[model samples]
Target: ADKELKFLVVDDFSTMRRIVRNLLKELGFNNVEEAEDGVDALNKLQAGGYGFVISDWNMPNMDGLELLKTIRADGAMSALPVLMVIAEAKKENIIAAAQAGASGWVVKPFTAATLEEKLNKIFEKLGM
Candidate 1:
């Protein structure tokens, strides 16, 4: 799975990206790359072959919601799995994310256990 699964970790903060990347590595996922924001994320995504996208909601040059919308709207990218991580954990925001076809949402300050649970749930639900 590590050889086949490629991940895109997008965040404006390099520290956050590094943290997430390392976390993925700890979870046995070594095929991962980083991007600063939605724009950079989209560019890397366009290059294709990314199996998963883990993105921060608040970012410069385009936010996670916009990125998710773009992906869902694009025929070629619509089916891509995207998990949004946000500090804003409001019901309305969660509702909006569900409506927009987000694979899952993780509120900020999440522990590694929380992330693992979310990812496992997504994979289980999607039959991936």
Candidate 2:
């Protein structure tokens, strides 16, 4: 994965957004931006330059699931790397995310190591 690859951190909680942003920095991802929710994320994403999206599954307007759906539909965004951040890890939810074309899912209470492995794992699979 490109170290300078731009990333969008999408979450309703600004605190959590900042947490992920900081963790991304630890992973050598410096070009990061923040978004409040799915719709907010789209507005920025539509403007271009984002290479990856780390989004919360639980959000107000447009959740990460819908965001992932939209991303998988568009030709360019379709292949974009999207890793869902979830509060819980239920079997059905895991199945749903898999079916929704999510590149990976990061459970809450994660550390920099967790994020690193997940991102590295996805990039390995994606060859990005």
Candidate 3:
């Protein structure tokens, strides 16, 4: 979509968040923020201005699947782009994420190229 799009990176681990943020920066996406978990992520999202989300699957208070469902349910954020950067690799997990309206999915410890490819795919699919 917009090159000026703001991103929210949600993960329980600070290190992982930093890594994702750095990767986004390297990709020329410097407008990024962070949240520790889904609850925090939801709060930030509701506050507004975020166009995309990159989240981990597992976390306390809330999880990625639930966050995805919540975002899909909310009229305001229903069409927002959500990219799941998670550790889960099961077929069922992928199916569930797709069913929940995730825009893209990637396994953890992914490469910069993988992130860029997934992001480009999502943007292309959305006709960004």
Candidate 4:
């Protein structure tokens, strides 16, 4: 397993970022980092080698959709797997995220088990 699969968890709230990072660690992903927003996430990503991204949909400067599109459009990071946690559970929103290439989507207020399930689904689909 790639324990070194660097993850960048992006969210405006420090508390949410910490929670996600800790959950990732508990799931055996130790190499995790945090960014405050999509802009900051993209900036840090330019310094590269990130295998995955987990982002929140509501944030200042840029939202999760923007970040996902940016990552998917960039030649160097196009294939990077991104899992988005959206604050709203709107069907249109979910469809848009999926259409824009989200590897996984979770509604906010999700539990660690829920996150794990989404990640597992992503891994299973990708055969990772």
- Top of the candidates by TM-score: 2
| Residue range 8-110, candidate 1, lDDT tens digits | 9999989989889888877888889989999999999999889899988888889988989999999988888899997878888888888888999998877
TM-score of each: 0.93, 0.97, 0.96, 0.93
Instruction: State the displacement of the C-alpha of residue 99, model 2, in Å, after optimal TM-score superposition.
Output: 0.6
> Model 3 has how many clashing residue pairs?
0
Per-residue CA lDDT of model 2 for 16-123, tens digit only, reads 998999999987899999999899999999999999999998899899899999999988678999999988888787788889999999889799999999999999
User: Which residue window of length 10 is worst by lDDT in model 4?
Assistant: 119-128
Candidate 4 global lDDT = 0.89
Model 2 worst lDDT window (10 residues): 86-95
Models ranked on lDDT: 3, 2, 4, 1
Better of 2 and 3 by TM-score: 2
lDDT for 63 in candidate 4 is: 90
Per-model CA lDDT versus the true structure = 0.87, 0.92, 0.92, 0.89
Q: Over all chains combined, what TM-score does candidate 2 have?
A: 0.97
Indicate the TM-score of model 1: 0.93
Clashing pairs in 2: none
Better of 2 and 4 by lDDT: 2
Q: Which regions of candidate 1 are displaced past 4 Å?
A: 1-3
**Model 4 ranges off by over 4 Å:** none
